[PDB]
């Protein structure tokens, strides 16, 4: 069973990443390098963040190191496993999301609750999955995808 | 006192609000009817939708009816009162957060239960404010606000 908290975390976080894979699958070969907006992430770039960030908040809730996390962020996410990857993310915070776990100060020294870091990382995966939308509207692809 | 769960949100949504409002007071008067990105909301248009949000979706959620969030959007907020009106939206959702409310199946027929709603209104804030940091950016402002 799980809590009201946890069965609102899955929904919502569940169609965060189900429409974030849709925008993903919508991306065409040539627009991986764009950058719409000049001075920040490419459109691979925001992919990439997105596909890792619901596994990456966890972990650096959970106490990983600055070094951990270079590891981690440096392992490379090809455009063909953007899915494969963005789903393990949401496996493992899933698993997260049900099981008990115990967080720590972040290394450069953040200190939230479990509930308080499964719900930064839903808010931190609805920022970006903004993004990439305005990134795919502002490259005409006029998304009709309904996102609530 | 307040559960774990509605300290993440009064958290995590006042992070929220209060980067808006910060994000607010840096539009400058030439920019509210500027729209970045063709087809889509100005930066004024944007900006009311953020500053009533938070009530509005907690209203939806009450059992609104079509006209009477007609009548709500209807309400004119001109540019120098929207502070003051994201102020009063995040009042709402603060009595809302802490007081046991009743939900409703909407009147375009979507049903979740009250800890559901104001997880979906935290996460609808955090989309726009993306949203409105995307226009910023696209109209050279760069941005350097701690958004986490
Ligand atoms: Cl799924
Ligand atoms: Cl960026
Ligand atoms: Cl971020
Ligand atoms: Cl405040
Ligand atoms: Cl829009
Ligand atoms: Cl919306
Ligand atoms: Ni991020
Ligand atoms: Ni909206």
Same mark, same amino acid.
């Given at each position: @069973?799980? /809590?009201?908290?946890?069965? +609102?975390?899955?929904?919502? =976080?569940? !169609? ?5 894979? %849709? ?39 959970? @106490?990983? /190191?600055?070094?951990?996390? +270079?590891?981690?962020?440096? =392992?490379? !996410? ?5 899915? %494969? ?60 995808? %309904?996102?609530?």
């Amino acid at each position: @069973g799980m /809590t009201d908290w946890q069965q +609102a975390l899955d929904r919502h =976080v569940g !169609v965060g990443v189900r429409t974030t894979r %849709d925008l993903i699958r919508l991306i065409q070969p040539e627009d991986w390098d764009k950058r719409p907006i000049s001075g920040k992430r490419s459109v691979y770039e925001v992919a990439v963040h997105l596909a890792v960030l619901l596994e990456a908040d966890l972990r650096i809730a959970t @106490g990983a /190191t600055a070094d951990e996390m +270079a590891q981690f962020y440096a =392992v490379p !996410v090809l455009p063909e496993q953007l899915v %494969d990857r963005l789903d393990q993310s949401w496996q493992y915070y899933q698993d997260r999301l049900m099981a008990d776990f115990s967080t720590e100060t972040t290394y450069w020294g953040v200190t939230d609750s479990t509930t308080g870091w499964l719900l930064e990382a839903a808010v931190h995966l609805y920022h970006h999955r903004s993004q990439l939308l305005d990134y795919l509207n502002l490259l005409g692809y006029d998304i009709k995808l %309904d996102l609530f």
